[PDB]
Structure formats: C-alpha cells, structure tokens
Ligand binder design. Structure first.
Ligand SMILES: O=C(/C=C/c1ccccc1NC(=O)c1ccccc1Oc1ccccc1)NO
Ligand SMILES: [K+]
Ligand SMILES: [K+]
Ligand SMILES: [Zn+2]
Length: 365
C-alpha cells in the first residue's frame, strides 16, 4: 500500500502498440521501464476491459454503438462517421473499439486499485486521451479514459483534482466537469491562434456551480523547465489550499518535451518531474496517465524517468540494453537536451495570468 500499482499486461501493450501514428510506443515505454528493473518495485496489475455499461457512464450509446460498428468492418459504407468525430484526426480503422475499451478499462482498473487502498499511486502510461467528448472522437482520442477514471474515483472521493500537463488543452475532460465544483480541472498548455484545440484561454473558468472550478494556463512556445515549474507550482499551491482535493488524476503527455514534432515547448522530464514531485508530496490517491508524445524514444525516456521519480529512485544516465536500444542513438542516454529556440513567454504576461488565477481561486470555498 506504499508500493505503486503499474497497470500492465502483454495483451494490453500489444493492443496499444497497434495504433498507426504512434506504433510500438506502449512497448517502447514498458520495455525501457522493465530494462531499468522498475517493474520489480511496483505491483503489476492486469487491466480489465471496460464494459459497455462502464463506458456509457460518460459516452452516449449512439456514439459507442457507432464506434463498435466501425471497429468490425471499416469506414466504407459509413458516411455517418463525420457526425461522431471520426476522420483524418481520428481514423475509423478496424479494431478501434477494442482499443478504446482496453484503455478505458485500464484507467478504471487503476482508479479501482486506488479506491481499494491497494496503493496511493496507480499508473497507466497508455492512457490520458483527454480530447474525446461524450459523443464525438477528437484529437486522436476515441474514448476519454481520464473522465471514466475520475468518475470511478468519485465513488469514494468527494473532491477530485485533474491536472493536465500535456501540451494541449484538456478540453474533453474540462467540458465534462465544467458545470460542477466536485471536480476541478487544471490545464497548462500552448494557447495560440490556430493551435489545437483552440480552447483554454485563462478566462475559461467554468460555468454555473462549476464557475472557478476550471483553471487554464495559456503558455507560448519555448518554455523551459525552470519557468514552467514556477508557473506550475505557483498555481498548484493556490489550488491545493482552495480546493483541498481528496484524490488526483494527473495527465503527463510528453509532447511538451524538446525534440517533439509538435516543436512548441522546450521542456525536459526533469522539469515535469519537479511538478510531479510537488503533487506526490501531498500524499493523496493519485492516478497517473500518459497522453501525447510523438518522439517515441523521448516519450519513453520521459515516462521512464518519471516512474523513477514516483519510486524515489535515481536512474543511470546510460540507457540499458533491451529490445529497442537502437532508437536511443546516437548518445544512448536518458537525459534530454533543450533545443536552442527562444522563450516567447513575456514575464509580465505570465504574472498577469498568475494573478488573475489567484484571484479566481479566492472565490473557491
Ligand atoms: O497531443 C495531443 C493531440 C494531438 C493531435 C490533435 C489533433 C490532430 C492530430 C494530433 N496529432 C498529431 O498532430 C501527431 C503529430 C505527430 C505524430 C503523430 C500525430 O498523431 C496523429 C497524426 C495525424 C492524424 C491523427 C493523429 N493531445 O495531447
Ligand atoms: K494540458
Ligand atoms: K469543474
Ligand atoms: Zn498533446
């Protein structure tokens, strides 16, 4: 019950590997974790597959049923797919319903371990698909596992904090809870004309009873570890005091990391780790999720490193030999180097944003 749960099975990783666009990522991540022998210090738990009942706690039957049909066959003979957000951004490829259910189940299983007092921290690195809407796929997210996890947690925990460090605004999750104060969502993300999904300005604060229970930190290109942590920690301190959460769901998409095709933020896993540590020192039930991350090796480096932090271990700089060793060339080290690009974040603007937020959280009761 001090030992973290690690949600894993070969069938689950195989299923997550089968995504074109990020092929074999789940495998690379697990493979590297295993190769630093970190699994030996965690409780490995086979994930369940989510039932239609479970998936419907958030998603609509119309949507789930459509997803199912498209999964069996394909998208020829389905011009209806546009209505449910399938298309270039969420290809209507065969087998996606099974994929969806695997991932939803995985996250739920994680949440269930936490409810059961099996652990204080539970990990599903192949989850975090935070864009999916109740009846619409979006941003390569077919099913919002984060939301399902949060809903499962609500059985035991009255107030839940969602923190979203992915490069993108966590809109799917926010929207799901925008009208309630029982879940607070906090997202740090790039906010910029034309940048997906386009939502999440600082003045996005929630609605009705949920007003002030959505926090959004719009950030510009080229941010680095030190400044990001200052921002993050400044915001999370206020949030803890104001919201006093009983449990935490934490999305750690690695598309913020230097070297990502997204080529926007300029972070390293150390910076993100500091943010992680800060949440961990609260000692709350914590559901850890992956998300974006499209430089596959770097994404594995990052999440492997962060598992290290969760375990309180220091990992060796030298990448261990293992299935995918070649992909870590030419230097074969764990550390990641910031690019040489400018930080476009003007300090005054940041300070405005931070103050505005502290003001908003005054209101919170
Ligand atoms: O990181 C994300 C979402 C990313 C995303 C959103 C809308 C459309 C495409 C996205 N994905 C990419 O641009 C992306 C970039 C590099 C490699 C693979 C990627 O996945 C794809 C690419 C094309 C279509 C679908 C998914 N959320 O955290
Ligand atoms: K985010
Ligand atoms: K909310
Ligand atoms: Zn992202």
């Amino acid at each position: 019950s001090l030992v973290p749960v690690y949600i894993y099975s070969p069938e689950y990783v195989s299923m997550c590997d089968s995504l074109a666009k990020i092929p074999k990522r789940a495998s690379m991540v697990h493979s590297l974790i295993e190769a630093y022998a970190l699994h030996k210090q965690m409780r490995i738990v086979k994930p369940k597959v989510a039932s239609m009942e479970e998936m419907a706690t958030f998603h609509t039957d119309a949507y789930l049923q459509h997803l199912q049909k498209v999964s069996q066959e394909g998208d020829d003979d389905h011009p209806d797919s546009i209505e449910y957000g399938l298309g270039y951004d969420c290809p209507a490829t065969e087998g996606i319903f099974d994929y969806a259910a695997a991932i939803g189940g995985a996250t739920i299983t994680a949440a269930q371990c936490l409810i059961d007092g099996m652990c204080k921290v539970a990990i599903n690195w192949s989850g975090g698909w935070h864009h999916a809407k109740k009846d619409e796929a979006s941003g390569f997210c077919y099913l919002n596992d984060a939301v399902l996890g949060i809903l499962r947690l609500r059985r035991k925990f009255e107030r839940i904090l969602y923190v979203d460090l992915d490069l993108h605004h966590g809109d799917g999750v926010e929207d799901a809870f925008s009208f309630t104060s029982k879940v607070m969502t906090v997202s740090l993300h790039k906010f910029s004309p034309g940048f997906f999904p386009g939502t999440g300005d600082v003045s996005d604060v929630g609605l009705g009873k949920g007003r002030y229970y959505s926090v959004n930190v719009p950030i510009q290109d080229g941010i680095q570890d030190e400044k990001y942590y200052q921002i993050c920690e400044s915001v999370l301190k206020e949030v803890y005091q104001a919201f006093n959460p009983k449990a935490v769901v934490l999305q750690l998409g690695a598309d913020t990391i230097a070297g990502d095709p997204m080529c926007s933020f300029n972070m390293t896993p150390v910076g993100i780790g500091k943010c992680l540590k800060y949440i961990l020192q609260w000692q709350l039930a914590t559901l850890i999720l992956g998300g974006g991350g499209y430089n596959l090796a770097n994404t594995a480096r990052c999440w492997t490193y962060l598992t290290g932090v969760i375990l309180g271990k220091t990992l060796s700089s030298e990448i261990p030999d293992h299935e995918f060793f070649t992909a870590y060339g030419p230097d074969y080290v764990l550390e990641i180097t910031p690019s040489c690009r400018p930080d476009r974040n003007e300090p005054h603007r940041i300070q405005q944003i931070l103050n505005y937020i502290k003001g908003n959280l005054k209101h919170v009761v």
